């Protein structure tokens, strides 16, 4: 079986390159961030513009939802993160502590902590309630491209331009694992699998890899796309067929069969690099977003 993703909506609004798109855990909303310093909220099913959330002083590289869909956290070149109440649009807290651009962010599954990665080569853990920095991890020797909590929040995974993925004990800050394969290209993205057994990592040699992080073994590689320059997100699609989804620097969305590693679909439409993709939590819907020559977000739907 292959999917049949077809374009349903194109979402215009951002005035510069879009940096990230994320579906709310409750399925209602899509959040986008951009180089234009704005966060936008859109209906997940119709693509209907909902509102703009404003306050960062420079471009935003990432945005992420709390697990109850009530909050967002964003990571900006202004060297802050901001925690937002989505319903009111209020900036609840500004997280100050990184010494350089903040590139990536996530809540833990409980949503009492935030993890952040920066050009300053650190990973930081923040208290959501107080907005204060709890721990700074001297994590990497180059900018940190992605950070993510595992299923129970006991671990953090980080990736970096230094060529490493690392696994951190949330509680102690100890480095529990370093992962790298036979070459040392920059690692541009990483996340845990939905079941928490694997990490999915992108490297800037046109390769996605699925790792068993506990055994430290690469189990699958996904290739065929173009990724040598940008920090492009990748996803597990789990609502229908079990796929891997990623943008690409040839302006397409790539979808692979997770088990077989074969390309099952390529989505054509964007006019620039597809920097970010996201998969809806319950319906077979992909959101894709593109860089400065395009500026749009697209919603695609499949029967499986």
């Amino acid at each position: 079986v292959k999917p049949n993703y077809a374009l349903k909506f194109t979402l215009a609004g951002h005035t510069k390159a879009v940096s990230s798109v994320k579906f709310s855990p409750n399925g209602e909303w899509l959040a986008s961030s951009s180089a234009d310093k704005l966060i936008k909220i859109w209906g997940a099913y119709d693509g209907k513009f909902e509102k703009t959330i404003s306050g960062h002083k420079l471009g935003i590289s990432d945005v992420a939802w709390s697990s109850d869909s009530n909050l967002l956290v964003s990571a900006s070149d202004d060297k802050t993160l901001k925690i937002w109440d989505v319903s009111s649009g209020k900036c609840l807290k500004t997280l100050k502590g990184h010494s350089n651009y903040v590139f990536c962010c996530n809540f833990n599954p409980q949503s009492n902590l935030i993890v952040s990665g920066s050009f300053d080569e650190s990973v930081r853990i923040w208290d959501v309630k107080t907005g204060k920095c709890l721990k700074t991890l001297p994590a990497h020797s180059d900018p940190v491209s992605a950070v993510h909590f595992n299923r129970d929040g006991s671990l953090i995974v980080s990736s970096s331009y230094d060529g490493l993925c690392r696994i951190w004990d949330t509680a102690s800050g100890q480095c529990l694992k370093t992962l790298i394969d036979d070459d040392n290209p920059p690692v541009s993205f990483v996340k845990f699998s939905p079941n928490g057994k694997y990490i999915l990592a992108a490297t800037l040699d046109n390769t996605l890899k699925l790792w068993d992080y506990s055994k430290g073994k690469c189990l699958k590689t996904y290739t065929g796309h173009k990724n040598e320059k940008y920090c492009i997100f990748a996803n597990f699609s789990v609502t229908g067929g079990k796929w891997i989804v990623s943008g690409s620097e040839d302006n397409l969305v790539y979808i692979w069969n997770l088990q077989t590693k074969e390309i099952v679909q390529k989505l054509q439409g964007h006019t620039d690099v597809v920097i970010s993709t996201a998969c809806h939590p319950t319906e077979n819907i992909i959101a894709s977003a593109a860089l400065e020559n395009d500026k749009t977000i697209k919603l695609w739907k499949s029967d499986c």
């Binding site: 990230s20 180089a35 590289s61 990432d62 900006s76 920090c231």
Partner: peptide
């Protein structure tokens, strides 16, 4: 930001 490299 992410939108430049």
């Amino acid at each position: 930001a992410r939108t430049k490299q």
